[PDB]
């Protein structure tokens, strides 16, 4: 509303415009403007700290750009006499990683300390600690040799600031798998009940007292007599009908979604989607009114009427913090007029300027033969063929060459023992070539380190002489793709000491590999709606054998009814009917009737075409009576005929038997999301792998191969069954027996019986620990009376 690029989404809300709807990111910016004493932002916070200790002020332009810092792994900072700065998204770059500083609430009704005051208080510790040395410095000498520099080492100042952004509970890595998650990470409040997010229209006051819209002071509430909703919560349509606990649970799952390749916008939403998307910052907004000049996937440029010229480089397939793709798309064309604050390009999870965290799917609410049993879900194979729920994921891999105790690490194509087929995908330097396909265990970068003395086994050398392969003097340390990962190689970042490249002391070269993969929606993944309902994809049925409407129109997913009984989640059923209304279109029968239910309604909402979008703001949206009338006017599909009655039900035909389902089933369109954690990442398996050093218990480091951990509670159950051998096997020859585990592996391959377990290394170490404590533990055999484990 009142935005040039805004699309056309009709609103039911019976009340007028809410308010200014203040810039959601301002809270993080205003505190920084004060702390830095920006001209736009009266004594500045930066100027105030020095006044206290004075006596016992400028920053130079930023060193490198935000894009440059995230690439070079440095910190976005401006020297002060390097002071970290804040970007347009209210974030910091510390050593190449995008970070956010949460705002603490530190009461004394309660008051919160915004980021500015937070960074200020950390400054004081460095000043007092730095001034403590000044006194010792200015006292320890003859005098008149003292200068300000010699008297002051600024180490405590810089250390406190660098030590604050890191290893601090307030400063956190920016959670970004979708623009909403990053937006709500900012504006989140913290206490030393402990965690909560800020109100939508909430506007903190200069000190940090929450002001609610004119704005009212906290103490001012006593003097004189939608604001309670957060950003994530204000996007749940039909929020009033769902339980409060379900709402919060539904909000958490919205910031848990992943960006889809197509990013379709919600069909039944609320007014917040537009303002929420552009404020997040992951969308491109025209700065000044004008017109575009040329549009390419790489950049968009607009020729302003003013005569100036601005351009925008589009993030393309940039990896997020959690591996999500950050692709931007251009929505405008050539010869198109634009306005200030209008959307130019779509972000990851946005379409035409509003948050598109999921897709709209046809839903049937029948229990379909136990395949949707109790929380699980069944989907049409269409969602795979049509890439509707497909999402791209990007993984980063790293390996470096540095100086060693023995020699110098060297990465090259030459590997001690390999076939030319594994190297078939490596270039000269030994790093995988761009655009290559990599399976589990393949080589990404070829590296080698010195080794010696070798002292090779005689049986090893005899083959060396027979086949004439000289035993090389160096050992293979080459980067291989982890177990269970696969994809294409997007790009490589090589940093070499030879030319330029400030790589830390010892490092001589660095190369990073970026791998990305299209992830088709797979059985096992997690989906969820905005109301807190979530479940695993239990099965995916071929589009053919799917319950389909009389059109022959197969339904996408089938949701079970059992969650509903006294678990209220009532809203989820409402957006399902409103979803079918929005998809099919309607034309109320108001010629002489003007039905009583539409009396409160606004004009011209009476008629809407097919596929229209709808917005029902949370605490005043579409009301119940109106929804019923809309199902009465539900225009036909291509050849005039009705698919959904006034009950939101239809006779579905079982696509596997052919006979219709005896009862009318509720069908509609619901907005669901693909959740963050996927099967591919969660499945693990191991037969043999790495073993810890101190304790021989198995551990999974690189190339995951991690071992499942058999706790005491599991041991309790094993004891309860009476399975003495299964328990002993798990605790001795599968975990700790340094000699047993290898013997059982040898036994399996030979096919011979499994050997007899030995002594768990854990227990052996136990005796030494007791002995180290001056306790003389004695094994006390029945016959020899004294045994050394050996």
């Amino acid at each position: 509303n009142s935005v040039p690029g805004a699309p056309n989404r009709v609103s039911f809300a019976k009340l007028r415009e809410p308010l200014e709807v203040p810039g959601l990111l301002d809270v993080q910016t205003d505190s920084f403007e004060w702390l830095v004493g920006s001209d736009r932002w009266p004594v500045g916070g930066l100027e105030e700290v020095l006044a206290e200790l004075s006596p016992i002020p400028r920053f130079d332009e930023v060193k490198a750009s935000v894009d440059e810092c995230k690439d070079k792994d440095m910190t976005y900072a401006a020297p002060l006499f390097d002071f970290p700065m804040m970007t347009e998204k209210g974030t910091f770059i510390i050593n190449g990683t995008e970070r956010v500083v949460v705002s603490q609430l530190v009461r004394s009704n309660r008051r919160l300390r915004t980021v500015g005051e937070l960074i200020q208080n950390q400054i004081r510790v460095g000043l007092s600690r730095m001034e403590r040395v000044v006194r010792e410095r200015m006292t320890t000498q003859d005098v008149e040799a003292i200068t300000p520099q010699t008297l002051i080492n600024i180490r405590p100042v810089v250390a406190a600031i660098k030590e604050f952004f890191g290893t601090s509970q307030l400063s956190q890595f920016m959670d970004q798998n979708n623009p909403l998650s990053g937006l709500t990470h900012k504006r989140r409040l913290l206490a030393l009940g402990l965690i909560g997010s800020l109100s939508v229209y909430a506007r903190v006051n200069p000190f940090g007292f929450i002001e609610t819209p004119d704005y009212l002071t906290a103490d001012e509430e006593d003097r004189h007599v939608r604001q309670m909703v957060s950003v994530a919560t204000a996007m749940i349509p039909f929020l009033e009908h769902d339980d409060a606990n379900r709402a919060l649970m539904g909000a958490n799952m919205q910031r848990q979604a992943v960006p889809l390749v197509r990013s379709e916008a919600p069909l039944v939403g609320t007014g917040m989607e537009l303002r929420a998307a552009i404020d997040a910052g992951d969308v491109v907004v025209a700065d000044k009114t004008g017109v575009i000049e040329e549009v390419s996937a790489d950049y968009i440029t607009v020729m302003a009427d003013d005569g100036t010229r601005q351009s925008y480089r589009l993030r393309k397939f940039a990896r997020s913090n959690h591996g999500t793709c950050a692709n931007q798309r251009p929505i405008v064309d050539a010869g198109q007029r634009v306005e200030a604050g209008q959307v130019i390009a779509d972000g990851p999870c946005t379409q035409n300027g509003e948050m598109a965290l999921g897709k709209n799917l046809l839903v049937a609410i029948m229990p379909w033969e136990g395949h949707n049993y109790e929380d699980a879900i069944i989907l049409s194979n269409r969602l795979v063929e049509e890439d509707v729920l497909t999402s791209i994921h990007i993984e980063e891999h790293e390996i470096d060459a540095r100086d060693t105790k023995l020699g110098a690490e060297e990465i090259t194509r030459d590997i001690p023992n390999v076939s030319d087929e594994v190297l078939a995908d490596l270039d000269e330097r030994g790093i995988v070539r761009i655009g290559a396909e990599v399976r589990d265990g393949d080589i990404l970068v070829g590296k080698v380190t010195p080794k010696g003395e070798t002292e090779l086994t005689p049986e090893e050398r005899l083959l060396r002489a027979i086949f004439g392969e000289k035993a090389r003097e160096v050992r293979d340390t080459s980067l291989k793709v982890p177990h269970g990962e696969s994809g294409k190689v997007i790009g490589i970042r090589v940093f070499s000491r030879e030319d330029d490249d400030e790589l830390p002391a010892g490092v001589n070269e660095l190369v990073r590999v970026y791998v990305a993969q299209k992830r088709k929606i797979s059985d096992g993944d997690k989906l969820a709606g905005r109301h807190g309902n979530k479940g695993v994809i239990g099965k995916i049925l071929p589009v053919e054998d799917m319950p389909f409407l009389p059109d022959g129109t197969p339904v996408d997913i089938i949701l079970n009814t059992h969650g509903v009984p006294r678990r209220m989640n009532i809203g989820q059923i409402l957006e399902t009917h409103l979803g079918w209304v929005a998809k099919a279109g309607w034309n109320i029968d108001v010629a002489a009737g003007v039905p009583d239910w539409a009396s409160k309604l606004p004009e011209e909402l009476y008629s809407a075409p097919a596929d229209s979008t709808v917005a029902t703001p949370v605490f005043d949206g579409a009301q119940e009576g109106e929804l019923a009338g809309l199902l009465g006017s539900t225009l036909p599909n291509r050849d005039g005929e009705v698919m959904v009655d006034a009950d939101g039900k239809s006779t579905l035909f079982d696509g596997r038997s052919g006979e219709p389902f005896p009862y009318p089933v509720t069908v509609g369109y619901m907005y669901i999301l693909k959740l963050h954690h996927l099967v591919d990442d969660k499945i693990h398996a191991r037969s043999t792998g790495p073993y810890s050093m101190i304790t021989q218990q198995p551990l999974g480091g690189k190339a995951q191969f991690g071992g499942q951990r058999f706790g005491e509670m599991e041991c309790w159950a094993m004891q309860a069954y009476g399975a003495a051998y299964t328990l002993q096997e798990l605790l001795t020859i599968k975990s700790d027996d340094t000699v047993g585990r290898v013997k059982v592996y040898e036994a399996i391959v030979k096919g011979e019986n499994i050997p007899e377990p030995g002594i768990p290394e854990s227990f052996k170490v136990l005796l030494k620990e007791l002995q180290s404590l001056c306790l003389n533990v004695e094994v006390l055999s029945s016959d020899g009376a004294a045994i050394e484990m050996r």
Binding site: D403, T457, P458, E459, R461, L462, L463, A465, I466, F467, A505, G506, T688, P690, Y691, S692, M693, I694, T695, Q696, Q697, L699, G701, T738, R741, V742, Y745, E746, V749
Partner: protein, 114 residues
Amino acid sequence: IQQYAREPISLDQTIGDEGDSQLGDFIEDSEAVVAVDAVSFTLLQDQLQSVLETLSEREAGVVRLRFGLTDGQPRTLDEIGQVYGVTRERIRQIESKTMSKLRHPSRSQVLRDY
């Protein structure tokens, strides 16, 4: 110098960050025996032993001593010749003929995979 000035970290330090698992138990003992190899190594010994049964008795003895399969100690040509009572040069001549015999495909194809 800047490498020398580095100070070590604590293994007992907990880096679980939600999970309370100390750093110590995350180090992979690299010397620990690889289960598959100690078996394939015992199978290579067996494969070699059989491959030697084709050679001459004197012949197998030389190759063994030269690489020390039987006594784990390699031997100079002089040393090998002293046990067989021959010149050190002849010992060199013997090895060559038997390396080309072991290079004969019959005895080698099996070993290439190893």
